[PDB]
Symmetry: C2
Subunit: 852 residues, 2 copies
């Protein structure tokens, strides 16, 4: 008792480079069996000219999989292709492979041949030991387990034609029982060695026409085909996409039979099917369609379909639809079951059954074809609803049957939170890969499940996926950016900005996000008793509301908090924090020293204690000279107040010297403008008359001071006394000290390391210009809001995408209400849009590499 779902799929089939191409051929009625000379001179040794073949075996993004070129040239192309296809299958489910690393996830691979092994070991003189590691059959599973870090069972298995569906069944049992949370299941077959086809020809199993005429009177054997298919199974609770739910599955074996080991026993096949329906409480009446093995042999077709008649049709009012993918693409031997499973799920996802080919006259030995109890799908029929069965029977008697319940979940009805703009990330091996995924997102921008899944798979280690991109969906522009990434560790720095960042109706754009709004309404609970509401202050576009120092300090800090809350919701944890002036309050919230209440109220009283105080009329001007040069050329009573950069220093004093010894600068052509402080001289001795009343209110607010982490660098206290006990905590004392001490900003920026990402946390990104000058060129400086930007939600999103571009992972899904998985039916496939770096070309065995 644990629910098992088919979550993701991918594959390569005859004439079909991915499952989109496979579908196109299926529903299009294209015969994928061909007669060219791809593997060997068609007709050689009197073999059928027709076989189902893959378009290509020579491509493999070796460096992504950690495989050096010498090892790649000696890998079974089965395995090279299965690595890609496996990755494609996992992400198709909307699951980041990283989230399964180290889990007890299993791998089962159905595989019957190792022809590359034979070829690559033919010459003792020149063969490589690596050939074993890349060709021994166990490695078809073990190398997958090695790459993905799956620590559950890792098993290669052969039951001939039933191998891959057996593999599925084994995986299903492992998940059901609780052994495994998930399973990668594979099926592979290649036609490299002609001698192999000769063996089957001499047994009389191959049709001369190279065609599986499933169910037709003129069936005379099967068509050999290739396939590489992979499917991700998970338990229901882990799944995002859900193609179908596995209701039951089992295997039996024909046993002893008078007629020989390769004569299939319809009677035992019947026993298997019977044992999985009524005994498990599942009615044959619930089936809509059964995918038969259907190899088109004189003997097997009647054994199978008659067994189906006795086990299923006999317990039914309605005709049972029946098909076989082998009619479309031939028989890929152990991969038959997964190949067929692919057709079934593709059919279900598009709402229409892909038809059989080659069905002209029913086999007269099969009563149910003649009386309509079985109805062959020879035209595209719509999917009316119901369960689906699948048979795979190996030529040594090993039988498998699985029962699927299709996922029929419909999409939600759209709501107001769906209409907001959304952010979409991608990563990739090539810029094409990223563009292709972003394009696919633009096109299905309203499918919210699809966008969630694509964001989840975008958070990938940067050495693996060196191109990244983002797009903002649901906005007038075409907002998109894509670039190559530095393999560097990129550390994350929060910068909380000070005064001068206020504006009319700031953050009203971001109240559409629930996490932002809830942070503002929580900031309201702190300052309601004191007669003010931050939401009312934001809403008010009375244009002088933020001239009041209390209105500004409280609103800036409450927003800085809401942004921090967003950044956190999205998974951004800072490596360093730095505050400028009033920013040191928000910094405390970011660091874990201050609760939201403590920070908002520290902002209130910091402003209210200035409002109530008689300080002498003072003013500040930024001036164009160094910190050191400001010591000398200042008069008395004017002091260096903010060390912004080595060019820009704010000074503070009374007008009694500030205006007149600003002109002794600006007559010598030096930069210098007054700043709108609301009439005060901050970060100077002049504020020291606030200390007693502020220190009292803040001791009633910051109950028990908590330590400041190493991550938080003070700008109030110079580096030499970071060890001091004033510095140790964010106390009432630290805060008061900030307000009277200078702002030692460039001093903290000297400590930001190479290749860092720096986020300016503030309702307008005032300090961008300073940060660029003040921190290393190798760093990337990112704003988060602009003043009077038409849409700040868009601006925030675009910049949050810019963080994804650096290499740092970001989950924008958390900004919006959670999507209810399982995803609805018909959510677009992801596997076909996964693009690899296929610039290299690897060796492939040829017919001449085998004996003759």
């Amino acid at each position: 008792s644990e629910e098992v779902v088919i979550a993701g799929m991918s594959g390569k089939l005859p004439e079909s480079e991915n499952l989109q191409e496979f579908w196109a051929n299926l529903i299009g009625g294209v015969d994928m069996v061909t007669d060219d000379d791809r593997r060997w001179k068609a007709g050689l040794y009197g073999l059928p000219k027709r076989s189902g073949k893959l378009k290509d075996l020579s491509k493999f993004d070796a460096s992504f999989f950690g495989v050096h070129p010498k090892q790649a040239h000696t890998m079974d192309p089965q395995l090279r292709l299965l690595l890609e296809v496996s990755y494609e299958a996992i992400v198709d489910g909307g699951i980041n492979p990283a989230s399964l690393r180290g889990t007890n996830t299993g791998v089962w691979v159905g595989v019957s041949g190792s022809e590359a092994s034979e070829a690559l070991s033919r010459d003792p003189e020149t063969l490589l030991g690596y050939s074993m590691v890349g060709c021994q059959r166990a490695m078809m599973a073990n190398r997958l387990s090695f790459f993905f870090d799956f620590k559950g069972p890792s098993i290669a298995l052969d039951t001939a034609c039933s191998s891959s569906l057996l593999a599925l069944q084994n995986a299903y049992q492992a998940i059901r029982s609780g052994e495994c949370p998930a399973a990668l299941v594979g099926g592979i077959n290649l036609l490299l060695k002609p001698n192999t086809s000769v063996q089957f020809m001499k047994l009389g199993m191959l049709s001369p026409d190279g065609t599986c005429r499933s169910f037709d009177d003129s069936g005379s054997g099967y068509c050999r085909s290739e396939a590489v298919v992979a499917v991700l199974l998970t338990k229901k609770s882990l799944a995002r996409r859900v193609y179908a739910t596995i209701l039951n599955a089992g295997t039996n074996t024909d046993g002893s039979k008078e007629q020989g080991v390769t004569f299939p026993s319809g009677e035992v096949q019947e026993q298997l099917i019977c044992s999985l329906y009524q005994p498990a409480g599942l009615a044959p009446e619930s089936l809509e369609y059964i995918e038969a093995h259907g190899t088109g042999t004189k003997v097997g077709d009647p054994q199978e379909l008659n067994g189906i008649t006795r086990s299923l049709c006999a317990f039914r009012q309605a005709p049972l639809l029946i098909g076989s993918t082998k009619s479309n693409m031939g028989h890929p031997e152990p991969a038959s079951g997964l190949a067929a499973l692919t057709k079934v799920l593709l059919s279900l996802e598009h709402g229409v059954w892909a038809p059989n080919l080659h069905f002209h006259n029913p086999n007269p030995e099969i009563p149910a074809l003649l009386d309509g109890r079985l109805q062959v799908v020879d035209r595209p029929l719509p999917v009316r609803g119901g369960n689906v069965g699948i048979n795979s029977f190996g030529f040594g008697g090993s039988n498998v049957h699985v029962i699927l319940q299709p996922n029929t979940r419909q999409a939600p009805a759209p709501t107001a939170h769906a209409a907001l703009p959304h952010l979409l990330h991608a990563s990739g091996r090539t810029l094409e890969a990223v563009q292709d995924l972003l394009e696919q997102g633009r096109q299905h921008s309203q499918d919210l499940a699809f966008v969630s899944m694509l964001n989840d798979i975008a958070a990938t280690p940067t050495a693996a996926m060196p191109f990244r991109g983002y797009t903002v969906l649901g906005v007038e522009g075409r907002v998109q950016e894509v670039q190559q990434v530095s393999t560097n560790k990129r550390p994350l720095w929060f910068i909380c900005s000070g005064m001068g960042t206020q504006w009319r109706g700031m953050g009203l754009s971001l109240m559409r996000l629930d996490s932002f709004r809830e942070s503002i309404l929580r900031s309201d609970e702190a300052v309601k008793p004191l007669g003010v509401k931050v939401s009312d202050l934001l809403l008010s576009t009375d244009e002088r509301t933020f001239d009041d120092i209390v209105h500004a300090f409280v609103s800036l800090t409450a927003i800085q908090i809401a942004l921090i809350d967003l950044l956190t919701s999205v998974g951004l944890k800072p490596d360093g924090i730095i505050g400028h002036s009033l920013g040191e309050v928000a910094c405390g919230y970011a660091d874990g020293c201050l609760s939201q209440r403590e920070a908002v109220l520290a902002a209130y009283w910091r402003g209210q204690c200035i409002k109530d105080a008689h300080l002498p009329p003072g003013s500040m001007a930024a001036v164009g000279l160094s910190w050191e040069e400001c010591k000398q050329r200042c008069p008395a009573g004017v002091v260096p107040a903010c060390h912004n950069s080595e060019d820009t220093v704010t000074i503070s004093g009374p007008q009694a010297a500030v205006n007149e010894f600003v002109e002794q600068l600006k007559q010598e052509g030096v930069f210098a403008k007054e700043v709108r402080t609301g009439g005060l001289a901050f970060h100077s001795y002049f504020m020291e008359g606030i200390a007693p009343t502020l220190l009292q209110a803040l001791k009633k607010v910051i109950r028990e001071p908590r330590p400041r982490s190493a991550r938080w660098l003070s700008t109030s206290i110079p580096e030499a006394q970071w060890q001091s006990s004033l510095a140790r905590t964010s106390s009432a004392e630290y805060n008061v000290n900030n307000l009277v001490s200078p702002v030692l900003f460039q001093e903290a920026l000297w400590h930001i390391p190479e290749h860092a990402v720096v986020l300016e946390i503030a309702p307008h990104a005032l300090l961008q210009a300073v940060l660029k000058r003040g921190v290393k060129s190798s760093c990337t400086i990112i704003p988060l809001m602009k003043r009077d930007h038409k849409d700040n939600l868009e601006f925030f999103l675009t910049n949050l995408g810019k963080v994804h571009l650096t290499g740092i992972n970001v989950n924008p899904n958390a900004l919006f209400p959670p999507v209810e998985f399982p995803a609805p039916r018909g959510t677009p496939l992801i596997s076909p849009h996964i693009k690899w770096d296929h610039s290299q070309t690897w060796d492939v065995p040829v017919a001449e590499d085998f004996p003759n």
Copy 2:
């Protein structure tokens, strides 16, 4: 929740044609790795000269397995050997494979190579399609499922070196969960293609010295070896033998590793082990011994043993014994786990751990070897008791661990009545096969569990096993007979003249016989007599009384029929001589035991009450026809025994004097004259008593041929049932015996059911020479239990199955530990010689 046991095993190992030879080499410290040119010129391509190799690959009893010679020459020798070894493994468990036919028994085979496939498909012109059916890897399992008719899962699997122990673990899970009642589990590896060794050499996995120096500082890689091993798993309730109980088992995979895919992760191996002990309520303290993978590589040995140290030694007071079969015989790759499992179970069964070879200086990177937390078994150590662990780790990271609880029934399995002599059957492909099994029985004659198991496996269809044999155990003789077989079964119930003093006192030792006699007592206790008292009495005239004789003969004839039935013998034809026709009715299903015993009573009591004149009978040597003429008056032909022998009946007033007019011319020759006129005065009073006894007459089957009623009136309504009327008619009518024997077909087996086999001489003359006539008791034979047994063996010799185990109290399985192995004594017809791929069949 379902208990899983290892029930049976067999195999072929380097230098070891069966597990007896393997054990001999193990405990004897023989290095089974060799350097001859068996597979390829030793040294070729710079390969090690040493590899572990099987003695032979060319033998396969093809016709037993239904394989035509063209298919056999193109079978992977892996599969040919695994078919034999699998059969050997199933019967080693004391299980007749027939009893698993049609069950949902599973097959899992660990296998990594199909070098025969490459060889046999090298030439398109001349290759056979059969090569696929005999070499594709799925067939290593599917052909087993096909031969044994196992309808559970049939899976061939590859995880490289861990494949066979993985296979065991998969089978274990299937039985545990209820999917399968039993599982055949296999492991196979051959060294046919040199190129394969070259690949391993270039990876740096093979030691140049061709030696697995498990745990030793001088380890430099592994020795490639061959093996073909098979083990039968069952749920506890099906098992006869129980080597061990699987307490837990699991697999994990190393996953990602900086050092590469073939660097083993001790840390992940440790995680596997940890997950199977404390979490399942099993203490590392309970382990006695751990069978390490132990391939003797610079890297792997420390990873493994250190992982063992952290997961197990750390939770222990005592040192943990450790070994590796690879030191003894090299590394047989996917078959490593089952090969090692074999050593462990053999050690447990002989009470001593086979030591490692090649262990001289501990690897210094393995702290626990230096501080004694791990103790390598480098000398034979006694088995002190405790659980056993087994590691098998494949070179691609796939790890398996199993925990075993050895069977601790040391004492024999409880039963009644062990001191009695016992009967042992065997069947075989050759006379050697039969002799070998019988010899093994003589030698362990007191091991009752062993004898039960060997009898169970002896019931095999005669076309499959054309030689048969038996031996009687626990008797002064050397009673043993063996022959080839090409047969319908006839019961003959005999009449009067078979009585004797203390008859059937020998057979009262058998519970089924005694219970039949005590049930015959319940019928005639109300009438004042006890059959058991009459038998016990060796007052030597007790059976002169007609009631005492009739009741005792018939009660015994019934007890014998009961024995024959308990043993599985159902008759194809039945024939009675005179009073025998009562017993015949019981055998046919017409008469209950009560009805038959009481019909015997009143038949005798009604004659006793009529008080008749002295009459007598003599068998004479002249035909039925000749008896009409040369008889006087008052003497008549009474019993047509053969065309030479006819019994006559009359008064002595002519019988003695007109017997001498014969026996002066050299002619062959309870006081009454039966089957004549003299008895016709009993008809009314007997017919009345028998109508009170046979309530509702039941029909006589076609199988029962009348001797009272001639063939022309078998259709009659007197003949239709065993009525009061049929019985009375028998007593007055002649006995048309030769007339019924004419109907016994060619090649029939004929059992004379009677307390003395009086009619043997007649039956030989009277039925075809092609038939086999068997007695069951003799008069005053020293031991009739012995005599019965010997003759019951003679029936097994004919081709007809017989389960003598039912004659004795049931053996309580599981069998005790140390019950001898059966697998090594199964011998095949290896007169043929099949092709084997050679080095020259592969590219160079």
